[PDB]
Symmetry: D2
Subunit: 131 residues, 4 copies
């Protein structure tokens, strides 16, 4: 399938069809991928530049009893290094119901929490495995 | 309230949610949408369900669309094939990637769209 | 060399390995050290084991050191207690963090140091 | 004592263990054998290692035997080749399924038998 863009050892798929957060993750899984994690400034830059003006689900979701933010691809969540990537004022847990995360703003400060059952475009990430 | 059966507690919800919002509720309660690994557990769940539909931990994974359990119990196709409603899973509309308990018998499971709202069942181990 | 039982294939090794080297071998065969989640599976395993000791997928995990299955089957402590040898797990020397099938009985499991070498049993689903 | 670097704490052990016994020690301390995801982290680790060999979270997984991280960080094979000692991994004796930090250089990693005993490095994120 076309639509996979390469960046630093991973391919990224910016969807054309919007889905709920979990239905997006399931699509990514059906393509041997996961909703993308973000672990560096250059990766965040790649994502929001490619996103343009559109909102995309990423692999941010609350997990555990405490509801700490986590990555669906099981990258350990680094709160210290992730603080710089939220939109100012986010996450705000509007309605006490915003348990998933999307990229929203055209900036390094781009993440927003939103209800998992809302439909948005989404970004899958899968590693390249050279022989 | 939680119900106890063979080393696990089970939560039969009173309010419906999407499959994933249900799983997040279970996770917030240190649990998961329930797996099913024996006829006695299947029987306990459908008898307790009382003829109502409840999300369980069934969901597709992998490129193959293989079914899986969200609590990471290995899914056993041979052992589980008799737990589906006859004709299910039929992936109706090409969009039924989660599973629920529906019919009151051992042949109980149906696949349904993950974004549909149903009551749900969490499962939590008792740990002495 | 794989033996079939109720939708799973099982490999009873002829070579002994440490618990983790055994698990690695199982992984290279698209499998894991076996979990045990029913009386009939326990019976099939101890009967086939024939009185020899085999590593199974039992291992301590998490901060509390509770017993777990390496294949990620949730561990049912209540229903598993009848599968340990009487008196086990006894954490001899404070260093027995993996488990094996030892006795030919439904009370079969013993905890032993993960770095000791035993025969091992892999399990993989019929797919 | 845990050493801090870029949002994670690190424990450099004083007693050697096998790879898996090392991982179990880390797990008992709410941690894992360390992953390595940047040049700056690789530099922090080998410089702190001071020329001694430490197990890290490198281990083979899957039927293919691809390298993986035990803390479940997805393994970036493209970006990690810079971190192996030239000529490694060489799977000596076809029995080297775990990895350690060995050479004090950005090219530091060696695969070695999982049953050999080395010092080890645990890693855990700061969680408020
Ligand atoms: O500056 S605010 O306007 O307060 N920012 C809010 C978000 O914080 C909130 O999550 C959404 C809900 O909409 S949703 O479609 O994402 O669910 O609406 C605005 O974007
Ligand atoms: O005999 S069939 O017609 O195939 N049975 C179908 C199901 O297989 C299908 O999942 C649902 C969709 O509705 S939903 O309520 O489950 O979403 O409708 C019927 O019950
Ligand atoms: O009733 S006891 O005799 O004390 N039971 C102990 C076990 O609990 C102990 O794990 C082993 C150590 O040997 S090992 O081979 O398992 O390492 O020896 C005995 O069998
Ligand atoms: O250039 S080589 O000779 O191939 N380098 C080898 C390593 O690749 C090999 O892993 C070890 C085994 O020793 S061990 O202590 O790590 O087990 O010995 C040398 O360092
Ligand atoms: N408002 C709570 C809700 C919550 C707790 N645990 C969770 C686990 C998953 C999803 C949501 C939660 C929070 O942000 O933490
Ligand atoms: N329960 C173990 C200690 C422990 C805690 N977590 C662990 C994880 C793995 C191995 C051992 C542990 C003991 O007392 O001896
Ligand atoms: N020669 C293979 C052996 C192997 C495949 N899968 C594994 C999983 C675990 C340990 C070893 C393997 C390799 O090192 O890649
Ligand atoms: Ca159906
Ligand atoms: Ca013992
Ligand atoms: Cl698409
Ligand atoms: Cl009971
Ligand atoms: Cl409820
Ligand atoms: Cl039964
Ligand atoms: Cl019992
Ligand atoms: Cl019992
Ligand atoms: Cl008992
Ligand atoms: Cl130490
Ligand atoms: Cl590289
Ligand atoms: Cl590189
Ligand atoms: Cl390179
Ligand atoms: Cl190399
Ligand atoms: Eu960087
Ligand atoms: Eu928000
Ligand atoms: Eu219906
Ligand atoms: Eu040497
Ligand atoms: Eu080597």
């Amino acid at each position: 399938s076309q639509g996979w863009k390469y960046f630093k050892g991973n391919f990224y798929y910016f969807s054309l069809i919007p889905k709920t957060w979990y239905s997006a993750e399931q699509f990514c899984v059906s393509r041997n991928s996961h909703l993308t994690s973000v672990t560096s400034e250059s990766e965040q830059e790649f994502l929001y530049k490619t996103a343009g003006g559109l909102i995309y689900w990423i692999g941010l979701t609350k997990a555990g009893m405490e509801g700490d933010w986590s990555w669906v691809d099981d990258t350990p969540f680094n709160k210290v290094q992730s603080v710089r990537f939220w939109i100012p004022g986010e996450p705000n847990n509007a309605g006490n119901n915003e348990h998933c995360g999307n990229i929203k703003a055209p900036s390094l400060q781009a993440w927003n929490d939103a209800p998992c059952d809302k439909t948005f475009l989404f970004i899958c990430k899968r590693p390249y495995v050279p022989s």
